[PDB]
Amino acid sequence: GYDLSVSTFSPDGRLYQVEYIYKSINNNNTALCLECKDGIICCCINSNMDKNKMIKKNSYNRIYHVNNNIIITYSGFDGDARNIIDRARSEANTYYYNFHTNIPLHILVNRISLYIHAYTLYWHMRPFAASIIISSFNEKDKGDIYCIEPNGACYKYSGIVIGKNKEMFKTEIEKKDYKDINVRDAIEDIYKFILTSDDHMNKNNLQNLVNFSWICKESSYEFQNIHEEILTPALNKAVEYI
Amino acid sequence: TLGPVVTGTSVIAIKYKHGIMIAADRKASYGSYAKFQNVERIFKINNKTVMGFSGELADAQYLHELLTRKNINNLSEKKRKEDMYTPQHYHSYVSRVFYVRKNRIDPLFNNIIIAGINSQKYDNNDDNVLLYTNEEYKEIHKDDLYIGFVDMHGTNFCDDYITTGYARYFALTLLRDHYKDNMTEEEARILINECLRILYFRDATSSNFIQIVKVTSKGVEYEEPYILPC
Amino acid sequence: KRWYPYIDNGGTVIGLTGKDYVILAADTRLSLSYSIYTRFCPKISKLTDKCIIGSSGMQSDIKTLHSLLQKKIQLFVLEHSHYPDIHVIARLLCVILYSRRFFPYYAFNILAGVDENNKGVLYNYDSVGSYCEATHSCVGSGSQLILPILDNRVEQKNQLIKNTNFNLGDDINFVKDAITSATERDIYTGDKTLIYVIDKMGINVNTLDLKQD
Amino acid sequence: TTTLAFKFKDGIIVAVDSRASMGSFISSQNVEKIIEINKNILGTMAGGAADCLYWEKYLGKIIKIYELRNNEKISVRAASTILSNILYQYKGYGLCCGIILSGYDHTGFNMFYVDDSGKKVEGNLFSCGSGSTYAYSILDSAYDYNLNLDQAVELARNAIYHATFRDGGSGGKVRVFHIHKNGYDKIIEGEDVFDLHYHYTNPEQKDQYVM
Amino acid sequence: SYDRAITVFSPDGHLLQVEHALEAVKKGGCAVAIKSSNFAVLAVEKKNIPKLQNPKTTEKLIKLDEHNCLAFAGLNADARVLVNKTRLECQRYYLNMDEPAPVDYIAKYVAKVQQKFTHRGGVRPFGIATLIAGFKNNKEICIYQTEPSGIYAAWKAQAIGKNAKIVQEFLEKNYQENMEQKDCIFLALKAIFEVVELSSKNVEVALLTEKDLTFIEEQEINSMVELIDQERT
Amino acid sequence: YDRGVNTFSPEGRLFQVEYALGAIKLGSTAVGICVNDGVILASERRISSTLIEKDSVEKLLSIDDHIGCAMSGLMADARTLIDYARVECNHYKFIYNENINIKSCVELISELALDFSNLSIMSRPFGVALLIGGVDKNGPCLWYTEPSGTNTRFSAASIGSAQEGAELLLQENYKKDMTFEQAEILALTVLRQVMEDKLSTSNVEICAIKKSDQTFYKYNTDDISRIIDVLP
Amino acid sequence: MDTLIGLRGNNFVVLAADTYSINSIIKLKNDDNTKFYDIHGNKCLLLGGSIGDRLQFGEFIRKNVHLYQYQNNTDMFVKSFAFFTRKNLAYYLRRNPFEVNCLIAGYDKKDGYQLYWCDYLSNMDSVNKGAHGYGAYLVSAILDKYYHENLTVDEALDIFKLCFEELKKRFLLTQINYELRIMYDNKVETQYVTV
Amino acid sequence: SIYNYNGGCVLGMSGSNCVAIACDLRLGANTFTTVSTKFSKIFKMNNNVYVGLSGLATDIQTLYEILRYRVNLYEVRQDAEMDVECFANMLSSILYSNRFSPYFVNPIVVGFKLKVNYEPYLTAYDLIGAKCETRDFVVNGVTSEQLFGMCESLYVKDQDENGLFETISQCLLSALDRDCISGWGAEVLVLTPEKIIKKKLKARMD
Amino acid sequence: RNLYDTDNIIYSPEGRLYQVEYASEAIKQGTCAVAIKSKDYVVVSGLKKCISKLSFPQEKIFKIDDYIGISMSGITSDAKVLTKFMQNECLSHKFLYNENINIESLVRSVADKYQKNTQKSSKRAFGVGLMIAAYHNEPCIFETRPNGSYFEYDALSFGARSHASKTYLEKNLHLFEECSLEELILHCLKALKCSLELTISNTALAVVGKNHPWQEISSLQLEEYLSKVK
Ligand SMILES: O=C(NCc1nc(-c2ccc(C(F)(F)F)cc2)cs1)[C@H]1CCCN(C(=O)CO[C@H]2CCCNC2)C1
């Protein structure tokens, strides 16, 4: 009876609706961000759409950006995450209007965390069902990656995975330190981890179900999606390895 | 803004064979006081769009901030280079802003030039845009180039060349006499320098310290500012 | 000083009906005080394939009003599944103009068209939305010059010997003579004129150069 | 502008000129200054043509809704009250209307004068516009309740003629409508008052008439 | 329930709140209205505690405006607030039109308000039925009966309230179109006394003409009650 | 009780509109027939008492001069809808100086219905079925609207208690080419078959909008007497 | 321009006004009926000033008092009526003023016959006699001279005849036609006096 | 000039175990036409609290109605008479609540403060509630200068009821005889802790 | 699941929103619609619902803009609301600016409108699925859903018995890119016919593409195409 409203604590001091949101997110499509020596690399594996064959090639992209220098991705429902990303862009716009400089990453993360958290307080609002990764990289400060949970918790990482099969992806990513590995070498490792972890993914759908993006030295520390010419030899080498 | 206090003087924009050439002296006057003499009055909107102003500096800076966030929001939603807003889109947006503020009796005391390149079929600068970091010029048809004027009352139009402020009398006479299609960079520079020379001699709010900006196939290039030769 | 929000950008729009056609000729000069912004700024906007609107006054108000009327006509077409004739568009324009009765559009308008019965129609409008049908009209800076000319040619009230048999070609040439006289005597009228002819086959545009001084 | 209306033995006569001007310039001579509010009520225009036209059309809309709801023809009194309240609500915003609403209802023939200032005056004889005093003088000189329809129409035509002759704001064509128990008739749809001067005042046409 | 929908559709398609309002009407005192050529008679049951309750205070026959009057059956306080709203609308019409409110307009407005209260969030339906007697714009007299649902209809003779059906079938077999005044009050009194106890203190009867609404003095009611006692034996 | 007004069923149907569709089944039977000469709407008036003023209850109404309508279900809700339709049709006439299309009037009526959904104020569905007949620039036509918000153009249609038998008879006997007089005969014969009465004057209500004046005409005793004498 | 006159004795109150409807320089009517507003229950509001403001305020007060009397099923007292009228006039004074001058007359059993003078600024007081308009300047002293407490109604009407004759003789607007309300002996009577 | 429309003046004076308030009775119109000669500007709030309102007559009536409303609510809520100082502070707050659209009134408050000891209490106001308490006398109205002169010359400390009546009446009448737009009768109230004497003076009618 | 399907803001223990799922379930009862495209064109076809013998077919496809149309499946009133919203957005973009609205921006705005009704307990999801066909620099087919998601397709179909149409599209997808317009119309009509005969009355059919505004195919041309299919 206590699990029918986000605004009610259960006798053991838990909000069951947020836990059910966590269960919803853990079944959704995988997303990961990884700090590297020269950049951050973001990768979204949309394994759920392996059934739908008529979807346009690479149309579905869960990787978005703010200010052309902050990557923002998610695992969860598309509409809620679009709402959060619109809030992030609004916060960046308001900050630049007030102060004439771009929003710091930690301030944006805190504000979006509060925005997510506010919907877990009242009996009439649906809490957002999405975990949100927000990340950036700079020449001086290196990489900063944050993950905002559906409960409003925000935590900083060197690398993070959310969504389906995140345990296996985390286990494979943890095998080696990536802060002394470049992003171009890291793409092959990400493809190998996807082939070993997600059972729906295979050689014939890696090219059209996976979104890639990064912020590194080669992109002048600004947002970009990986071109096909860089992706194709990497996934070919991963398939040959596997 | 009840009226102007810190004012920028004329701006002159023309089409030439490789794109748009837009010029303005770097002076902002506090009435008869030439208080500021190294001010920027030509703003980059995007890689194929620039904005220039004559009149009050505060209103122009407010408009520049508006167009900056409009460009950033455009970039956030972009997936291909054709999704980038054109100079005529920004001209329509600025005209609407001026029109609504005119209806509120709260005008921006400015005359605005919005200039640039309408077509994406000349370069791939918008495929990978860089906001925080900067071969021969391609010949561009004048139909693919855009220069547009807006005033305080929202009267908006476009032409092959546009002038604001005192340039509407001094520079524009020489432009209407001597302008021709498909001018080279040298000819456009010479014509603009002649116009700015006449303005320097006859406009008391004018300076001989010029800023030139070129919108070409290789994007927006801010030339090093110079004193008028001779 | 308070900022005055109205400016007259000048130029003429002349309209003349036939039995089954209507001519609307507008000059293209755009001016401020004694200076010229540009020599080509069309004053006539297409609304439907048998209806156009020309206006004279403040160019920003004219452009916004024409775009607004076009937007509402497209909305009408999508919602009610038929193109409105000139009388429907005329009442719509009257309501739109009166909706800003206390801060009017700074524009005098002529709505020209061919109705469902293949009859040429002109409606003339002041700023606040008072309007009426006419067989000939003129608005803009040179209207006081041209309205007597149109009165003398069309109605011939003060002529015992009346030649009231007109065709489309003579009407076009007479409208050209009228806009030429307006260019001669009105400083704000000149450069070029766009002449729209609406008849059974639809709308046809033609150009005539005028004096540029 | 000159409008007039008067009640008589066979109903109501309404009459108007057709001039519209912008200061000194005559913008039109074909203006329709009598509006069919409904099948039995006519309304005149004097002053602001925009306000008169718009609010008389609005009154027609309200009357149509009232008649459709109640299955009944509205009275002239109620229409005049609605118009006067609507015009009074915009007091101080510069509306300029002088309107004579005349018609037939279940309480007989009725006539009301209403202007922008909330005025609402019941009577049997009214005139509005810049030439109103001249039409008043002619009508009051010659008005009788037992005039026949032809006599009443001729009197209205003569009053409008003299108003247009004296007043620079009035001219063009005279229209004379007749409201009866079963609608209204346009007795004089439009008659150029150029002819009326050389009928009444200068029939000989051998010299300029000296006022 | 600031804006919660209180009236909603049941699985069979009924609006149960309106039915419960009708049940509240069925508990109320009986009222009867009868039409004639140029007048109407309205009679209402009244129950008061003898020797303790002031009989003047409870008015179930009410003058709405210059020329219209109202009887009701159901919750008294709901009747009071709706009657005051109707009086306000009567004077609003007479302000906006400069002619008194016709009876058909008033009945339509009362029906509209009742329907609105069946169809707005956060408001209960009015638990009353009403009989509105009055004059049309053409001076024809009419009686309009309205229900809690907002349905209305005009009637030659009608009854509302408790045991209204028996009074209805009586009036069907005894209404005789145009009638003199005395027989009209007599018909109203016997019709309401079919269901109501036969005493003069248990009824209030009034007559509506063009000029005013006049309440019949108790002596006439006593005499007619004695006559009704006589005819029943 | 427990489900809000906006609750979806497991089949993807709103509970309240499904329940409101039971209300339209109740009421008096009406028929509409559209032919090239015009549209006719006929209706039965189940008069409960002899003391009721017969003309006071109206089953056929005029939304406009060129639009007639027959209502079924909850009559107060129906009168609310028709009043809104009258106001918006007069608003269209004022704004555009022409008679509104029948489809546009039907569409705005069905937009007022389902206003309780609050997608962008009424609290519940209306529980009303309307047959809206009229004559516009595209000739005569007849539309049917219901609490779900769906509009459906019909050559011939029925509403009310005897909707099933009325539509069966109309399906059997309707032809696209029949004349106005045959359409009146068909309407009154269908009403005769579905009624439990002898079909006299002041027992049915008839209205029509023709393509000669495009004006709503409410019939009188002579017209029903004529058509009844013409009936076989 | 609208001359209003009022005179109160122990057994009556009398109000009077010119019957002219003015529009710029022309008399629309010589039998105007937009000044007197008779209220149910022995009450009268005689209004001056602009015709539109007169109509709006007079009908507003009339419809409010009638609503009161039908809602409560009693006749409002004359004092309550007068102070309600003053309160409503003063409420609009600082928001869209009604430029109307008022004489408020009535009869009560509680307070007998009553007259209240009230101007466009809502400055009100009970008076035995009062006047409004420019013509007030030419009639008030006559009301001061010939008034006494025990006047009969006919003597009061003779005083009003003196006032009307002086308004004809001396006032710039030669006002000839007058209407009169006579409240006395529980009846309200209308009279029309020419010259 | 708004105060010249009706004219009017109010005065108050203190004695030993007694206080007095007084006012003229004119209601004028357009500064020169007398329209009433019984328009009393003194109002009883309670037995120990009186207020004299001079200025525009509509604002006098409106403010008196507001003050009566507030005082009656206070007294029925507390079941006791309002203190004169509490009333004076309340009048200040009411006048200041309309600071930018003030009631064109210049009140005085005259009464007894209760301590049973009955201390005289007098205070004068401006239109926005700026109040000055005095031990001797208070004046407001268009005749303020003449009243100030008369009271300065003639005021005698700690007079009995009769002497207070004569002094305040002579002050008011002499001040009114030099003012065009005030006069036409004079009301004088003399309060003592057991009773009130209301008198109407045989005043000029010019 | 009866506990958790009562209000639209409640997640089930499996992390499911049952009311949004029921709004999606409303879409499968609509009549079938199909949309395919080539390099140049998008062809939309649909089965018009006919509820009785004397009825006329329910309209299935609607024009949004000169190069934008839609088809709907589900509750038609919700579809009407979304249609009016889309038409107003298109005309507002054509009013403020002088260009056609970006199709991706329009679809995102519609999806935001979908999602905003899923957040509050006083609102319900739109119980309708839209397929949006347009030509904005290329043929494009989008789909919207009650949960505020949207997708882009090379070929799309949904409604009652749309599984057979989906199977036909799965088989024949590789042909559509190089198909001409006539072959594309034939393929779309065959895919629709797999869901079932078709008739000029009961078959909505429209085309949009390069140099080709949105146009319903006329009854005579539709008769020719239906004859060719049979
Ligand atoms: O009368 C003129 N033409 C014919 C027209 N008749 C009308 C008209 C006439 C009668 C009625 C009604 F009563 F029957 F309803 C309604 C409308 C409007 S126009 C011109 C005469 C000189 C002034 N003029 C100009 O256009 C001057 O330029 C303006 C442009 C914008 C503002 N600044 C100056 C109009």
PDB file of C-alpha atoms in Angstrom, chain D residues 71-136:
ATOM      1  CA  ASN D  71     -37.718  32.256 -30.974  1.00  0.00           C
ATOM      2  CA  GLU D  72     -38.780  35.907 -30.910  1.00  0.00           C
ATOM      3  CA  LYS D  73     -38.074  39.181 -32.702  1.00  0.00           C
ATOM      4  CA  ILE D  74     -36.248  41.659 -30.484  1.00  0.00           C
ATOM      5  CA  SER D  75     -37.692  45.079 -29.718  1.00  0.00           C
ATOM      6  CA  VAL D  76     -36.088  48.311 -30.883  1.00  0.00           C
ATOM      7  CA  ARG D  77     -35.848  49.372 -27.223  1.00  0.00           C
ATOM      8  CA  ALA D  78     -33.784  46.323 -26.256  1.00  0.00           C
ATOM      9  CA  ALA D  79     -31.460  46.667 -29.258  1.00  0.00           C
ATOM     10  CA  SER D  80     -30.961  50.355 -28.459  1.00  0.00           C
ATOM     11  CA  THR D  81     -30.221  49.494 -24.820  1.00  0.00           C
ATOM     12  CA  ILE D  82     -27.669  46.854 -25.855  1.00  0.00           C
ATOM     13  CA  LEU D  83     -25.971  49.282 -28.245  1.00  0.00           C
ATOM     14  CA  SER D  84     -25.943  52.102 -25.686  1.00  0.00           C
ATOM     15  CA  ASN D  85     -24.425  49.859 -23.005  1.00  0.00           C
ATOM     16  CA  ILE D  86     -21.788  48.558 -25.441  1.00  0.00           C
ATOM     17  CA  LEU D  87     -20.852  52.097 -26.472  1.00  0.00           C
ATOM     18  CA  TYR D  88     -20.844  53.350 -22.868  1.00  0.00           C
ATOM     19  CA  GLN D  89     -18.413  50.593 -21.857  1.00  0.00           C
ATOM     20  CA  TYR D  90     -15.858  52.234 -24.206  1.00  0.00           C
ATOM     21  CA  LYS D  91     -16.340  55.696 -22.678  1.00  0.00           C
ATOM     22  CA  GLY D  92     -13.112  57.697 -22.824  1.00  0.00           C
ATOM     23  CA  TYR D  93     -11.473  55.632 -25.607  1.00  0.00           C
ATOM     24  CA  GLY D  94     -12.581  58.030 -28.345  1.00  0.00           C
ATOM     25  CA  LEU D  95     -15.412  56.124 -29.997  1.00  0.00           C
ATOM     26  CA  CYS D  96     -17.415  58.447 -32.268  1.00  0.00           C
ATOM     27  CA  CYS D  97     -20.920  57.210 -33.129  1.00  0.00           C
ATOM     28  CA  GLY D  98     -24.248  58.890 -33.729  1.00  0.00           C
ATOM     29  CA  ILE D  99     -26.873  56.284 -34.620  1.00  0.00           C
ATOM     30  CA  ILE D 100     -30.634  56.289 -35.170  1.00  0.00           C
ATOM     31  CA  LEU D 101     -32.122  52.818 -34.674  1.00  0.00           C
ATOM     32  CA  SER D 102     -35.665  52.616 -36.053  1.00  0.00           C
ATOM     33  CA  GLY D 103     -37.904  49.635 -36.544  1.00  0.00           C
ATOM     34  CA  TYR D 104     -41.141  47.765 -35.985  1.00  0.00           C
ATOM     35  CA  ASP D 105     -41.698  45.299 -33.144  1.00  0.00           C
ATOM     36  CA  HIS D 106     -44.653  43.847 -31.229  1.00  0.00           C
ATOM     37  CA  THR D 107     -45.026  47.233 -29.461  1.00  0.00           C
ATOM     38  CA  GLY D 108     -45.404  49.067 -32.801  1.00  0.00           C
ATOM     39  CA  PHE D 109     -43.038  51.450 -34.551  1.00  0.00           C
ATOM     40  CA  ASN D 110     -40.139  52.688 -32.406  1.00  0.00           C
ATOM     41  CA  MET D 111     -37.162  54.987 -32.920  1.00  0.00           C
ATOM     42  CA  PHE D 112     -34.151  55.665 -30.679  1.00  0.00           C
ATOM     43  CA  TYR D 113     -31.137  57.973 -30.901  1.00  0.00           C
ATOM     44  CA  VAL D 114     -27.942  56.505 -29.408  1.00  0.00           C
ATOM     45  CA  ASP D 115     -24.417  57.980 -29.428  1.00  0.00           C
ATOM     46  CA  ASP D 116     -20.989  57.008 -28.106  1.00  0.00           C
ATOM     47  CA  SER D 117     -21.525  58.789 -24.754  1.00  0.00           C
ATOM     48  CA  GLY D 118     -24.142  56.281 -23.551  1.00  0.00           C
ATOM     49  CA  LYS D 119     -27.009  58.500 -24.715  1.00  0.00           C
ATOM     50  CA  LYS D 120     -30.310  56.763 -25.453  1.00  0.00           C
ATOM     51  CA  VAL D 121     -33.314  58.932 -26.342  1.00  0.00           C
ATOM     52  CA  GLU D 122     -36.736  57.748 -27.516  1.00  0.00           C
ATOM     53  CA  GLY D 123     -38.516  59.940 -30.030  1.00  0.00           C
ATOM     54  CA  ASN D 124     -40.471  60.265 -33.259  1.00  0.00           C
ATOM     55  CA  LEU D 125     -38.002  62.451 -35.208  1.00  0.00           C
ATOM     56  CA  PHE D 126     -34.188  62.545 -35.187  1.00  0.00           C
ATOM     57  CA  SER D 127     -31.317  63.793 -37.316  1.00  0.00           C
ATOM     58  CA  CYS D 128     -27.564  63.272 -36.936  1.00  0.00           C
ATOM     59  CA  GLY D 129     -24.346  64.396 -38.604  1.00  0.00           C
ATOM     60  CA  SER D 130     -22.843  67.719 -39.586  1.00  0.00           C
ATOM     61  CA  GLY D 131     -25.960  68.678 -41.584  1.00  0.00           C
ATOM     62  CA  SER D 132     -28.374  67.601 -38.844  1.00  0.00           C
ATOM     63  CA  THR D 133     -29.542  71.123 -37.965  1.00  0.00           C
ATOM     64  CA  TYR D 134     -30.586  71.871 -41.552  1.00  0.00           C
ATOM     65  CA  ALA D 135     -32.575  68.636 -41.835  1.00  0.00           C
ATOM     66  CA  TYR D 136     -34.133  69.384 -38.436  1.00  0.00           C
TER      67      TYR D 136
END
